[PDB]
Scaffold this motif. Structure first.
Motif, PDB file in Angstrom:
ATOM      1  N   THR A 181       0.901  -1.180   0.000  1.00 33.08           N
ATOM      2  CA  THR A 181       0.000   0.000   0.000  1.00 33.08           C
ATOM      3  C   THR A 181       0.920   1.205   0.000  1.00 33.08           C
ATOM      4  O   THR A 181       1.916   1.218   0.751  1.00 33.08           O
ATOM      5  CB  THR A 181      -0.978   0.054   1.166  1.00 33.08           C
ATOM      6  N   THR A 182       0.534   2.174  -0.798  1.00 37.11           N
ATOM      7  CA  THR A 182       1.302   3.436  -0.818  1.00 37.11           C
ATOM      8  C   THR A 182       0.518   4.517  -0.034  1.00 37.11           C
ATOM      9  O   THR A 182      -0.710   4.587  -0.112  1.00 37.11           O
ATOM     10  CB  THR A 182       1.672   3.797  -2.269  1.00 37.11           C
ATOM     11  N   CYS A 183       1.298   5.325   0.677  1.00 36.34           N
ATOM     12  CA  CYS A 183       0.747   6.437   1.466  1.00 36.34           C
ATOM     13  C   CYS A 183       1.551   7.656   1.162  1.00 36.34           C
ATOM     14  O   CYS A 183       2.788   7.546   1.127  1.00 36.34           O
ATOM     15  CB  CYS A 183       0.816   6.123   2.951  1.00 36.34           C
ATOM     16  N   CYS A 184       0.911   8.793   1.028  1.00 36.44           N
ATOM     17  CA  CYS A 184       1.659  10.017   0.678  1.00 36.44           C
ATOM     18  C   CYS A 184       1.414  11.126   1.677  1.00 36.44           C
ATOM     19  O   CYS A 184       0.339  11.253   2.260  1.00 36.44           O
ATOM     20  CB  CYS A 184       1.315  10.473  -0.748  1.00 36.44           C
ATOM     21  N   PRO A 185       2.445  11.972   1.883  1.00 38.54           N
ATOM     22  CA  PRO A 185       2.373  12.999   2.904  1.00 38.54           C
ATOM     23  C   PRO A 185       1.540  14.182   2.547  1.00 38.54           C
ATOM     24  O   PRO A 185       1.127  14.937   3.439  1.00 38.54           O
ATOM     25  CB  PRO A 185       3.842  13.405   3.131  1.00 38.54           C
ATOM     26  N   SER A 186       1.294  14.360   1.253  1.00 38.75           N
ATOM     27  CA  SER A 186       0.527  15.488   0.735  1.00 38.75           C
ATOM     28  C   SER A 186      -0.029  15.117  -0.629  1.00 38.75           C
ATOM     29  O   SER A 186       0.412  14.140  -1.234  1.00 38.75           O
ATOM     30  CB  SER A 186       1.363  16.759   0.620  1.00 38.75           C
ATOM     31  N   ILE A 187      -0.967  15.933  -1.069  1.00 39.44           N
ATOM     32  CA  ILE A 187      -1.602  15.727  -2.401  1.00 39.44           C
ATOM     33  C   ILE A 187      -0.549  15.825  -3.520  1.00 39.44           C
ATOM     34  O   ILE A 187      -0.540  14.999  -4.427  1.00 39.44           O
ATOM     35  CB  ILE A 187      -2.792  16.662  -2.568  1.00 39.44           C
ATOM     36  N   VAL A 188       0.265  16.864  -3.414  1.00 40.70           N
ATOM     37  CA  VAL A 188       1.233  17.012  -4.515  1.00 40.70           C
ATOM     38  C   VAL A 188       2.245  15.843  -4.547  1.00 40.70           C
ATOM     39  O   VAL A 188       2.660  15.383  -5.635  1.00 40.70           O
ATOM     40  CB  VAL A 188       1.822  18.441  -4.450  1.00 40.70           C
TER      41      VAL A 188
ATOM     42  N   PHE B 270       3.964  11.127  -7.370  1.00 41.45           N
ATOM     43  CA  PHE B 270       4.100   9.677  -7.318  1.00 41.45           C
ATOM     44  C   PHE B 270       3.433   8.998  -8.517  1.00 41.45           C
ATOM     45  O   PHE B 270       4.008   8.092  -9.146  1.00 41.45           O
ATOM     46  CB  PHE B 270       3.552   9.168  -5.977  1.00 41.45           C
ATOM     47  N   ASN B 271       2.207   9.439  -8.780  1.00 40.05           N
ATOM     48  CA  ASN B 271       1.461   8.818  -9.876  1.00 40.05           C
ATOM     49  C   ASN B 271       2.106   9.080 -11.225  1.00 40.05           C
ATOM     50  O   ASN B 271       2.090   8.208 -12.091  1.00 40.05           O
ATOM     51  CB  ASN B 271      -0.002   9.275  -9.845  1.00 40.05           C
ATOM     52  N   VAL B 272       2.697  10.269 -11.380  1.00 42.95           N
ATOM     53  CA  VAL B 272       3.462  10.488 -12.614  1.00 42.95           C
ATOM     54  C   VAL B 272       4.720   9.584 -12.686  1.00 42.95           C
ATOM     55  O   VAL B 272       5.028   9.000 -13.723  1.00 42.95           O
ATOM     56  CB  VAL B 272       3.823  11.981 -12.824  1.00 42.95           C
ATOM     57  N   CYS B 273       5.440   9.512 -11.565  1.00 46.77           N
ATOM     58  CA  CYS B 273       6.603   8.633 -11.451  1.00 46.77           C
ATOM     59  C   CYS B 273       6.263   7.187 -11.857  1.00 46.77           C
ATOM     60  O   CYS B 273       7.084   6.532 -12.512  1.00 46.77           O
ATOM     61  CB  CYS B 273       7.159   8.726 -10.037  1.00 46.77           C
TER      62      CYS B 273
ATOM     63  N   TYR C 256      11.576   9.355  -4.168  1.00 48.89           N
ATOM     64  CA  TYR C 256      11.533  10.534  -5.036  1.00 48.89           C
ATOM     65  C   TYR C 256      10.530  11.600  -4.550  1.00 48.89           C
ATOM     66  O   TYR C 256      10.707  12.795  -4.790  1.00 48.89           O
ATOM     67  CB  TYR C 256      11.267  10.041  -6.473  1.00 48.89           C
ATOM     68  N   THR C 257       9.448  11.128  -3.906  1.00 50.15           N
ATOM     69  CA  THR C 257       8.346  12.004  -3.500  1.00 50.15           C
ATOM     70  C   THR C 257       8.117  12.252  -2.015  1.00 50.15           C
ATOM     71  O   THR C 257       7.397  13.180  -1.647  1.00 50.15           O
ATOM     72  CB  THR C 257       6.986  11.421  -4.032  1.00 50.15           C
ATOM     73  N   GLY C 258       8.699  11.375  -1.197  1.00 51.95           N
ATOM     74  CA  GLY C 258       8.346  11.370   0.214  1.00 51.95           C
ATOM     75  C   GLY C 258       7.161  10.471   0.567  1.00 51.95           C
ATOM     76  O   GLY C 258       6.796  10.352   1.742  1.00 51.95           O
TER      77      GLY C 258
ATOM     78  N   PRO D  58      -1.256   6.077   7.963  1.00 50.12           N
ATOM     79  CA  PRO D  58      -1.308   6.913   9.173  1.00 50.12           C
ATOM     80  C   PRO D  58      -1.723   8.329   8.842  1.00 50.12           C
ATOM     81  O   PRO D  58      -1.657   8.768   7.664  1.00 50.12           O
ATOM     82  CB  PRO D  58       0.069   6.817   9.798  1.00 50.12           C
ATOM     83  N   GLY D  59      -2.098   9.080   9.873  1.00 53.31           N
ATOM     84  CA  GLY D  59      -2.626  10.427   9.695  1.00 53.31           C
ATOM     85  C   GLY D  59      -1.644  11.444   9.087  1.00 53.31           C
ATOM     86  O   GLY D  59      -2.110  12.443   8.528  1.00 53.31           O
ATOM     87  N   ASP D  60      -0.364  11.147   9.270  1.00 54.02           N
ATOM     88  CA  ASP D  60       0.632  12.033   8.656  1.00 54.02           C
ATOM     89  C   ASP D  60       1.068  11.622   7.223  1.00 54.02           C
ATOM     90  O   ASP D  60       1.916  12.294   6.616  1.00 54.02           O
ATOM     91  CB  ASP D  60       1.866  12.198   9.597  1.00 54.02           C
ATOM     92  N   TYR D  61       0.459  10.536   6.740  1.00 53.84           N
ATOM     93  CA  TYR D  61       0.605  10.106   5.345  1.00 53.84           C
ATOM     94  C   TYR D  61      -0.816   9.839   4.795  1.00 53.84           C
ATOM     95  O   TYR D  61      -1.109   8.728   4.372  1.00 53.84           O
ATOM     96  CB  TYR D  61       1.535   8.897   5.158  1.00 53.84           C
TER      97      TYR D  61
END
Length: 46
Positions: free
Chosen positions: A1-8, A13-16, A29-31, A41-44
C-alpha cells in the motif's frame, strides 16, 4: 500500500509510476511511503 504525505506528493508519485518505476523509487523521489498493511497513518493521509 502506498501512502503520501501530501496531495502534490501523491500527484508526483502517480506520474513517477507512469513509466513503470518501482514504487520504492517513486517513494524516495516524492516522500511517499510503502507499507505492508492497508491503513495509512494520519501524517501520510494522501
Amino acid at each position: 500500500t502506498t501512502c503520501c504525505p501530501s496531495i502534490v506528493a501523491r500527484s508526483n508519485f502517480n506520474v513517477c509510476r507512469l513509466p513503470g518505476t518501482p514504487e520504492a523509487l517513486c517513494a524516495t523521489y516524492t516522500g511517499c511511503i510503502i507499507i505492508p498493511g492497508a491503513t495509512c497513518p494520519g501524517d501520510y493521509a494522501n
